[PDB]
Amino acid sequence: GSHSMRYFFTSVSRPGRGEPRFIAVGYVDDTQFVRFDSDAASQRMEPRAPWIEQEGPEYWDGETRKVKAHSQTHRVDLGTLRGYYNQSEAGSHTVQRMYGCDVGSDWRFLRGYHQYAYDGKDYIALKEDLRSWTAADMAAQTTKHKWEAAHVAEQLRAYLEGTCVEWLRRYLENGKETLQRTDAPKTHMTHHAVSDHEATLRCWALSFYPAEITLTWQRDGEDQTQDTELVETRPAGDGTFQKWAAVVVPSGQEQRYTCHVQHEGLPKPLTLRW
């Protein structure tokens, strides 16, 4: 299937003393594999998956250098944007960055991205064509002009089409044991009675990865969304994921309803019945 590599950065300004709180994490697909925290003692980029640990000291020197420099850009930006928006020095503010690359099943470049946010709203984003920018307001437009004059997009395009894809490929190979393994959901259904008239069927999907997955109900072979509930996908804590979907039914008619599970690790979707 398709894969991605994606970095996330959060900076939170600290009014009254000192530099922002800065947290960086890196993913391959739904697996975290790197981390920098400004509050941490090491002041290094640190491993968070086993396959990243066979990179040598030069890797961690390099990534530490870059991620610290990342951190300084963000610090500067928080000052800059505060000016842009004519805000006092009194409040805490946030910048957030993600960038990274998707590849398809053949591991070839499919797309990449570079998005930027201020206090939790769109600021500026690299467009799909990787040659142009989306700026959300006039502050963001000033940044756009800057980055247009400096040919930022070209630099990012080279990274996103080249080194991003190359190193994602390396990671996928190195971590094949787990990163190229799909874990189909372990599924079951449960039953719970509200009154004498009404029961709830709950469809469980446990211990699956990647996180992507579809649960649906049918009544008598037809999709039903009414009287259903679907929980956000949550992490199990061991690297896999959980989800459930429930429907309310008239007591005694349980047999009418079926739960349908799609996921990358099942060759054909599954069907469950009480």
């Binding site: 890196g26 990534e63 870059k66 991620v67 850009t73 500067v76 930006d77 930027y116 400096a150 190193w167």
Partner: peptide, 9 residues
């Protein structure tokens, strides 16, 4: 690996 340089906004 990370991109090598971020220009200020």
């Amino acid at each position: 690996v990370l991109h090598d340089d971020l220009l200020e906004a």
